[PDB]
Design an enzyme around this catalytic site. Structure first.
Site, PDB file in Angstrom:
ATOM      1  N   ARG A  80       0.858  -1.178   0.000  1.00  0.00           N
ATOM      2  CA  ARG A  80       0.000   0.000   0.000  1.00  0.00           C
ATOM      3  C   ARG A  80       0.895   1.229   0.000  1.00  0.00           C
ATOM      4  O   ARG A  80       1.846   1.305   0.783  1.00  0.00           O
ATOM      5  CB  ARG A  80      -0.932   0.004   1.212  1.00  0.00           C
ATOM      6  CG  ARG A  80      -1.841   1.225   1.326  1.00  0.00           C
ATOM      7  CD  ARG A  80      -2.966   1.223   0.297  1.00  0.00           C
ATOM      8  NE  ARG A  80      -2.567   1.825  -0.970  1.00  0.00           N
ATOM      9  CZ  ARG A  80      -3.310   1.822  -2.069  1.00  0.00           C
ATOM     10  NH1 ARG A  80      -4.507   1.262  -2.091  1.00  0.00           N
ATOM     11  NH2 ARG A  80      -2.840   2.398  -3.171  1.00  0.00           N
ATOM     12  N   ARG A  81       0.599   2.179  -0.883  1.00  0.00           N
ATOM     13  CA  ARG A  81       1.451   3.351  -1.025  1.00  0.00           C
ATOM     14  C   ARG A  81       1.463   4.167   0.263  1.00  0.00           C
ATOM     15  O   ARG A  81       0.472   4.229   0.997  1.00  0.00           O
ATOM     16  CB  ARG A  81       0.984   4.220  -2.196  1.00  0.00           C
ATOM     17  CG  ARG A  81       1.528   3.812  -3.568  1.00  0.00           C
ATOM     18  CD  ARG A  81       1.313   2.337  -3.882  1.00  0.00           C
ATOM     19  NE  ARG A  81       1.634   2.018  -5.268  1.00  0.00           N
ATOM     20  CZ  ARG A  81       0.733   1.842  -6.225  1.00  0.00           C
ATOM     21  NH1 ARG A  81      -0.564   1.928  -5.978  1.00  0.00           N
ATOM     22  NH2 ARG A  81       1.144   1.571  -7.461  1.00  0.00           N
TER      23      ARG A  81
ATOM     24  N   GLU B  22      -4.149  -8.381  -7.242  1.00  0.00           N
ATOM     25  CA  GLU B  22      -2.906  -9.139  -7.358  1.00  0.00           C
ATOM     26  C   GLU B  22      -2.906 -10.356  -6.438  1.00  0.00           C
ATOM     27  O   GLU B  22      -2.378 -11.410  -6.809  1.00  0.00           O
ATOM     28  CB  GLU B  22      -1.687  -8.254  -7.093  1.00  0.00           C
ATOM     29  CG  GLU B  22      -1.654  -7.540  -5.765  1.00  0.00           C
ATOM     30  CD  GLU B  22      -0.734  -6.336  -5.799  1.00  0.00           C
ATOM     31  OE1 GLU B  22       0.040  -6.210  -6.771  1.00  0.00           O
ATOM     32  OE2 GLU B  22      -0.785  -5.511  -4.863  1.00  0.00           O
TER      33      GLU B  22
END
Lengths: 475, 285
Positions: free
Chosen positions: B179-180, B237
């Site tokens: 997660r960014r 993903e």
């Protein structure tokens, strides 16, 4: 003016750090703290704090507090060397850098093993960062003894100031080292270790510093492949496209002399970093008075050559903005299809490469693109008036750049330019000479040594030999 | 000794002697000569006692590239060195400069070291050899005529020595999901470690990413604090990786495990006990 009041030293450096006879652990721990704080209120005051900081540093150097400090960083019962190094930080300008480079690379690089306390690592990293700005000899002693390893190990850390210091130290070492220094840095796999610094999200200065470091490492074409295998060069272009130098800009003539080679390179990432930093420094220097250091340093012609042959929007953007901020004409990108040029295009190209004096002769003789691409030294000397033997060398350098950048689509039928470029990127200049004589891929296997000299105009014997021995491979 | 100096002791002693005799102290000159400009050329000329031929150099605009390729005819005709031995003095100075210079910008195969191994006086030919597009892999085919006409080596003995010395030469494995702004640092360190320890990796540099997930032999999932609470990219993903079922390893960092994705085990991350968690993860996948 005003700073003279503090120059009279109203504090006497607090009775010369309490007569140096504190004798107590808490005594010295206290004594360092207020002289520290005093140096920060000296530094952080408007427009004369910068000047009075040098006065404080000179006073400390004269009093011997520097050597005092270098004997203070050893006391084992004094676990708090943190204040000692954190005071060494602010007092370290080039005049003190010489003195400490003389004697203290033993004590500093012995302290460099103390990596556990972050509050002391944040200071010793800054010490190494400031030291790396010194001469190549200092850089080589630090690299050989372990300063580079100490900087490398601190890339796993998290403290913003410590990471900033590590990135700036690596950039400083890359800039001020030599071939051996850069070779060892890439050997320790520093290119791979700049990834966690350039790929950050909390802050942007760390990203810019890591990208500058890797871009400086990418202009040494002995280690270009090794740098590119790390994947760190992929982060430069998106970062430069995302950031804005107009307000982020918040150096010296020697420092910008190490930025110009980034402009004058074939690497797109290096050119982009150079243009970004040059635009920021141009903004700051134009705002803070006026200075014509750029003309002497030669960044003007570099910016002009990074826009005339520019093929990247971001590079062009940074360039055009820098040229506008410096208050100069912004040359237009020239058309790639040079064999289809006319007299107007030739005149513009002459004006954009500083050969504006030999423009009336070209106009009078009516030189178009086709005549320009087939121009001999006898013609230059006799007809167009370039008598000087090295003015012609400069002109042929410019013409070589144009021939390499040109677009031979109307002339080249068998795509000989790509064949020459596969052999050598500097062989692409011979395309027009090869195709105007009636040659192509299917006919190169019958050409001779004398033909490539008299007809095609390939002057260097090494190039002729390489082209022949690679054309015989076609069969 | 103050200009080409490389040792401070020596530089300090020379500077002190010059100041004590009351003379200006020349500044050290940059080693990277091919990147020089007019100002650097002028300073170098002033430092070696050729101040008379300074306006000619300025008018002809000689930079580093032109300086390192300067011939007898050019000196005699264009810059004005009529005297036959003044040019010998100038070429002595230029030879010293070429020996001292720093060819990293143009030299790719480290040919200067090869020449210096032969003879410390052979290092001046580096720029001449590399301006003709030569390197270590191409020296075993150069000729006697080429070394004279193109490279500029004049002395026959040097050409013969260089010739005779030249003739004797004779799929991504792991994929990282994060997660960014939360775990990006962990992903960076993880990729760096796995690349250092010989495993290929594909990190999201920011559907073909899904193809890369397929191509990857293994998969890496970081458990950042407050990462899965949002759920997506991580969702697509992870389900794509589960479609194959190939070594799904979550690294726990403050994750309390709030489908059928949670039925897996992993390793807690230690910030300071590094190279141990990485050592375990190597055995794990």
């Amino acid at each position: 003016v005003q700073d003279a009041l503090e120059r009279a030293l109203p504090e006497l450096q607090q009775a010369l750090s309490a007569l140096k006879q504190a004798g107590g652990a808490r005594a010295v721990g206290a004594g360092l703290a207020e002289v520290f704080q005093l140096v920060e209120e000296a530094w952080l005051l408007p427009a004369v704090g910068r000047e009075v900081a040098q006065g404080l540093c000179d006073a400390i150097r004269l009093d011997g507090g520097l050597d005092l400090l270098l004997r203070l960083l050893q006391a084992p019962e004094l676990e708090t060397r943190v204040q000692a190094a954190r005071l060494l930080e602010q007092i370290l300008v080039a005049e003190n850098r010489d003195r400490v480079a003389r004697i203290g690379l033993g004590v500093i690089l012995n302290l460099a093993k103390e990596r556990e306390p972050v509050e002391l690592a944040r200071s010793v990293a800054g010490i190494l960062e400031h030291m790396f700005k010194h001469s190549e000899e200092t850089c080589q002693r630090l690299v050989a003894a372990g300063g580079l390893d100490a900087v490398l190990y601190w890339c796993r850390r998290t403290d913003p100031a410590l990471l900033r210091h590590c990135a700036l130290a690596l950039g400083n070492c890359a800039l001020h080292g030599g071939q051996a220094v850069q070779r060892r840095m890439v050997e320790k796999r520093a290119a791979e270790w700049l990834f966690p610094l350039a790929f950050s999200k909390e802050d942007e200065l760390l990203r810019l510093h890591a990208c500058l470091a890797v871009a400086v490492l990418a202009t040494n074409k002995e280690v270009e492949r090794e740098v590119e295998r790390s994947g760190t060069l992929a982060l430069v272009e998106p970062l430069v496209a995302s950031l804005d130098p107009g307000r982020f800009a918040r150096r010296g003539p020697d420092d910008l002399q190490r930025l110009v080679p980034l402009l004058d390179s074939n690497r797109l990432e290096a050119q982009c970093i150079g243009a970004f930093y040059l635009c920021a420094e141009a903004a700051i220097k134009s705002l803070q008075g006026k200075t014509k250091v750029f003309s002497d340093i030669g960044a003007i012609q570099s910016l002009k050559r990074l826009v005339s042959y520019s093929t990247n929007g971001t590079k062009s953007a940074l360039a055009k903005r820098a040229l506008r901020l410096l208050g100069e004409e912004v040359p237009r990108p020239i058309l790639p299809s040079v064999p289809s040029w006319k007299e107007a295009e030739v005149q513009t190209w002459l004006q954009q490469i500083g050969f504006s004096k030999y423009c009336e002769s070209f106009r009078e003789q009516q030189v178009d693109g086709d005549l320009l691409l087939r121009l001999t030294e006898e013609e230059l000397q006799t007809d167009l008036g370039m008598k000087s033997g090295i003015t012609r060398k400069r002109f042929f350098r410019e013409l070589t750049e144009l021939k390499t950048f040109a677009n031979y689509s109307t002339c080249d039928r068998s795509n000989l330019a790509d064949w020459l470029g596969s052999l050598d990127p500097r062989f692409r200049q011979y395309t027009y000479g090869l195709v105007s004589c009636g040659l192509d891929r299917s006919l190169l296997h019958r050409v001779s040594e004398q033909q490539l000299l008299e007809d095609c105009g390939i002057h260097l014997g090494v190039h002729r030999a390489r082209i022949l021995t690679a054309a015989r491979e076609m069969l | 000794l103050v200009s080409y100096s490389t040792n401070g002791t020596k530089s300090a002693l020379a500077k002190r002697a010059l100041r004590l005799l009351g003379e200006e102290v020349p500044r050290p000159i940059l080693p990277s000569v091919p990147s020089w400009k007019e100002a650097e050329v002028q300073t170098w000329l002033q430092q070696i006692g050729f101040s008379k031929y300074c306006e000619s150099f300025r008018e002809q605009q000689v930079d580093g590239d032109l300086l390192l390729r300067l011939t007898e005819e050019e000196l005699q005709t264009d810059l004005g060195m009529k005297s036959g031995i003044t040019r010998k003095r100038f070429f002595r100075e230029l030879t010293e400069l070429k020996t001292f210079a720093n060819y990293s910008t143009c030299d790719r195969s480290n040919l200067a070291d090869w020449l210096g191994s032969l003879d410390p006086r052979f290092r001046q030919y580096t720029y001449g050899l590399v301006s003709c597009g030569l390197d270590r892999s191409l020296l075993h085919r150069v000729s006697e005529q080429q070394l004279l006409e193109d490279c500029g080596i004049h002395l026959g003995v040097h050409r013969a020595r260089i010739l005779t010395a030249a003739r004797e030469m004779l799929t991504p494995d792991v994929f990282i999901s994060y997660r960014r702004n939360s775990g990006s640092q962990l992903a960076s360190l993880l990729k760096v470690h796995l690349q250092l320890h010989g495993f290929s990796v594909f990190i999201d540099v920011e559907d073909k990413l899904i193809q890369s997930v397929m191509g990857a032999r293994n998969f890496v999932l970081v458990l950042s604090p407050g990462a899965l609470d949002k759920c997506d990219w991580v969702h697509k993903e992870i389900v794509t990786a589960l479609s194959c079922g190939k070594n799904i390893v979550p690294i726990i960092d403050g994750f309390e495990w709030p489908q059928a994705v949670l039925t897996f085990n992993g390793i807690k991350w230690s910030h300071e006990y590094q190279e141990a968690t990485i050592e375990k993860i190597i055995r794990f996948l």
